Amino acid sequence: CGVPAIQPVLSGLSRIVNGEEAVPGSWPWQVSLQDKTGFHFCGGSLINENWVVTAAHCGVTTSDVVVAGEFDQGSSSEKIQKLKIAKVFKNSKYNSLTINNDITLLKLSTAASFSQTVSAVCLPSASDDFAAGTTCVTTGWGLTRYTNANTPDRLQQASLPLLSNTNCKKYWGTKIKDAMICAGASGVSSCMGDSGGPLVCKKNGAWTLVGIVSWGSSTCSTSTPGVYARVTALVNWVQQTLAAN
């Protein structure tokens, strides 16, 4: 888990504005959700070859499909895996107004073949403690929501820091709950992360999933932080589900 076959290269440009492109395959547990029509609509993480973490509010259903091993969303050459979901597990506690508890698992039909460019992230322990001020990374094709506005068909990356839930508050007041976690503000956007996209952190040589793109800056401001699923808080769940299925 969390030890890519292709170790990612992160420049400082990763630290400002709208981040920077990623080395292709640099982030393998990274997936995309496409609907029927095939609209890349959400982001996710392989925590295994049978399961996918994701943001609750992505309201994914078995109609959607998981895309894997992608890099540039505008490529047919891709040696990508398109996977079907068997069943879909939204955290029962998922609040829809606050968007607190924003998580949901995807247990696939067929199991995804891992690979160099295909694998999973590591999950924290509830116990884990990613101090505030930690440098993390968010990746995605969020900036692509810019249809006429854009950036890269290609996965971008960004390096932002962990926040105190308090300081975070200084930006979103109460929106911010105990199961959330914010990262950003450091003069670089976060809109590069799709929803359900990952916010991982290193430590002990591994990239561990720390949170999940919940929501952030209407305007992609570089002064506003991002909100994510406080994974630590959401992990037992995971585990539990993971067992019982």
UniProtKB/Swiss-Prot annotation:
<dbReference type="Pfam" id="PF00089">
    <property type="entry name" value="Trypsin"/>
</dbReference>
<feature type="active site" description="Charge relay system">
    <location>
        <position position="57"/>
    </location>
</feature>
<dbReference type="InterPro" id="IPR009003">
    <property type="entry name" value="Peptidase_S1_PA"/>
</dbReference>
<dbReference type="GO" id="GO:0097655">
    <property type="term" value="F:serpin family protein binding"/>
</dbReference>
<comment type="similarity">
    <text>Belongs to the peptidase S1 family.</text>
</comment>
<feature type="propeptide">
    <location>
        <begin position="147"/>
        <end position="148"/>
    </location>
</feature>
<feature type="disulfide bond">
    <location>
        <begin position="1"/>
        <end position="122"/>
    </location>
</feature>
<dbReference type="InterPro" id="IPR043504">
    <property type="entry name" value="Peptidase_S1_PA_chymotrypsin"/>
</dbReference>
<feature type="disulfide bond">
    <location>
        <begin position="191"/>
        <end position="220"/>
    </location>
</feature>
<dbReference type="GO" id="GO:0007586">
    <property type="term" value="P:digestion"/>
</dbReference>
<dbReference type="GO" id="GO:0005576">
    <property type="term" value="C:extracellular region"/>
</dbReference>
<keyword id="KW-0222">Digestion</keyword>
<feature type="active site" description="Charge relay system">
    <location>
        <position position="102"/>
    </location>
</feature>
<dbReference type="GO" id="GO:0006508">
    <property type="term" value="P:proteolysis"/>
</dbReference>
<keyword id="KW-0645">Protease</keyword>
<dbReference type="InterPro" id="IPR001314">
    <property type="entry name" value="Peptidase_S1A"/>
</dbReference>
<keyword id="KW-0378">Hydrolase</keyword>
<dbReference type="InterPro" id="IPR033116">
    <property type="entry name" value="TRYPSIN_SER"/>
</dbReference>
<dbReference type="GO" id="GO:0097180">
    <property type="term" value="C:serine protease inhibitor complex"/>
</dbReference>
<keyword id="KW-1015">Disulfide bond</keyword>
<feature type="propeptide">
    <location>
        <begin position="14"/>
        <end position="15"/>
    </location>
</feature>
<feature type="disulfide bond">
    <location>
        <begin position="136"/>
        <end position="201"/>
    </location>
</feature>
<feature type="active site" description="Charge relay system">
    <location>
        <position position="195"/>
    </location>
</feature>
<feature type="disulfide bond">
    <location>
        <begin position="168"/>
        <end position="182"/>
    </location>
</feature>
<keyword id="KW-0720">Serine protease</keyword>
<keyword id="KW-0865">Zymogen</keyword>
<keyword id="KW-0964">Secreted</keyword>
<feature type="disulfide bond">
    <location>
        <begin position="42"/>
        <end position="58"/>
    </location>
</feature>
<feature type="domain" description="Peptidase S1">
    <location>
        <begin position="16"/>
        <end position="243"/>
    </location>
</feature>
<dbReference type="InterPro" id="IPR018114">
    <property type="entry name" value="TRYPSIN_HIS"/>
</dbReference>
<dbReference type="GO" id="GO:0004252">
    <property type="term" value="F:serine-type endopeptidase activity"/>
</dbReference>
<dbReference type="InterPro" id="IPR001254">
    <property type="entry name" value="Trypsin_dom"/>
</dbReference>
<protein>
    <recommendedName>
        <fullName>Chymotrypsinogen A</fullName>
        <ecNumber>3.4.21.1</ecNumber>
    </recommendedName>
</protein>
